[PDB]
């Protein structure tokens, strides 16, 4: 496959402008399904996918309470990291965390993840074996020890091997309609002259799900890696993605050029070219 | 489903 579930937490301190803000979002694959923002009037976990709406009262209370408790704990964590690094009370800092699971055969965990970053740099990660940690530096080693002392890896492992993987299949069942249907890219090559000598060839891939794609320009079956402009895969907002690969070519030589599209929804890879 | 709170206090960084 593989299907996955990921929760993305962002804790941001803001001295003088209030207590740290906590944001959590939930993804199954490339589809967001929940959000929580501590900045709301009465912060409540909110549904962000149709298939999650069905869940009963308990799901909302549970999610809200986890996130509200994590908010408080993230304020505390932010104060700790400030101290580990002997940081000013005035500066604004961010702890980020991504954790989740990759769905293997028989619905068992294929891969577990738990990673944290301080101000955009790797801080502490749970290892592939799910029992150990890799601390990026000396400050993260203080965290490592707090966690080893509290047997956190075992607690986190229980969740990844169990609850996480169970709840991912469920969501996948409830939303099989969209989560289990891969939308292939709708593709075309455009031509835009640049001068009498040169022209831009743009390979478009539109409306695909999930985001993983490879767009490759090939001159005579040779990768144009060096001079191919590639845009970051971008969301169309309808839950699908868009991407284009562009290359400047000599005028009248356009036929030497070929576009290669690799996508999950595509049974076989696509070999694309400009057809005026 | 997010990770559930442990029975005790949540461990910080």
């Amino acid at each position, epitope marked *: 496959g593989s299907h996955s579930m990921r929760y993305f937490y962002t804790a941001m301190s803001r001295p003088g402008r209030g207590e740290p803000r906590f944001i959590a979002v939930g993804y199954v694959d490339d589809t967001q399904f929940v959000r929580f923002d501590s900045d709301a009037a009465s912060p409540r976990t909110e549904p962000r996918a149709p298939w999650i709406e069905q869940e009963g009262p308990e799901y909302w209370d549970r999610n809200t309470q986890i996130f509200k408790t994590n908010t408080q704990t993230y304020r505390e964590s932010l104060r700790n990291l400030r101290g580990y690094y002997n940081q000013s009370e005035a500066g604004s800092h961010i702890i980020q965390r991504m954790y989740g699971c990759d769905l293997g055969p028989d619905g068992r965990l294929l891969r577990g993840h738990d990673q944290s970053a301080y101000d955009g740099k790797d801080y502490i990660a749970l290892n592939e074996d799910l029992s150990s940690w890799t601390a990026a530096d000396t400050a993260a080693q203080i965290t490592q020890r707090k966690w080893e002392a509290a047997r956190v890896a075992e607690q986190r492992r229980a969740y990844l091997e169990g609850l996480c993987v169970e709840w991912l299949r469920r969501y996948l069942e409830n939303g099989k309609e969209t989560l289990q249907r891969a939308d292939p890219p709708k593709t075309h090559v455009t031509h835009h002259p640049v001068s009498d000598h040169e022209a831009t060839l743009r390979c478009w891939a539109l409306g695909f799900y999930p985001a993983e794609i490879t767009l490759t320009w090939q001159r005579d079956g040779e990768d144009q890696t060096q001079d191919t402009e590639l845009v970051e895969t971008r969301p169309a907002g309808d839950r699908t993605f868009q991407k284009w690969a562009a290359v400047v070519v000599p005028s009248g030589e356009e036929q030497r050029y070929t576009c290669h599209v690799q996508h999950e929804g595509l049974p076989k890879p696509l070999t694309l070219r400009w057809e005026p | 489903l997010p990770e559930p709170l*442990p029975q005790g206090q949540l461990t910080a960084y």
Partner: antibody
Amino acid sequence: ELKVEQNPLFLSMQEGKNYTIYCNYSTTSDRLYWYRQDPGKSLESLFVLLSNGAVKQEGRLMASLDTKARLSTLHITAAVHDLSATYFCAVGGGSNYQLIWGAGTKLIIKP
Amino acid sequence: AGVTQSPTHLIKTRGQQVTLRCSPKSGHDTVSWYQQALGQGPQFIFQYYEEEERQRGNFPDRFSGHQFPNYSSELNVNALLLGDSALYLCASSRTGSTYEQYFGPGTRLTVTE
């Protein structure tokens, strides 16, 4: 829709021997519990099984969860008279607060 | 402290009213109410969380509940019917936690002619 059926309704057993009681449920489980009730008393918690392949052992009791078969089993090992009670099974589904309960399995451990 | 319930028992007649009290285990914030009839499995009345009735079972309006800001609860049952005789049980749990749910000792209601 979420239906919970336990079996047998009652079990006659010899002390020292091993026995298995069953809990079948119809729809996706969020939580599966095992409770113990003594005559004229309330419900004592024993186990909560949350995901497929969960196995929990507390003393002479062991509870397992098979979400594929939508079955939970309670194993009573080296049965002792003191284990005599009604053993219940409760299941929660659809992230609802409402737990559906089985009719119970009365355990009669004979000396 | 563990899950507590009051009163121990009630002996009523039809058309009467009762209130029953439950206090969750220290650390628990949500409370469950169940009716248990002779030789029967418990039946869900309601769950209270954040002073609100979160969900209800197959029970009429004469079954009314309350949750206080200290997480303690009340189950009021008016226009009592002979069928209302049961063991009224309360269970509590800590929201977003490990899924434990503990029961109180129960209040034994008897509705007699």
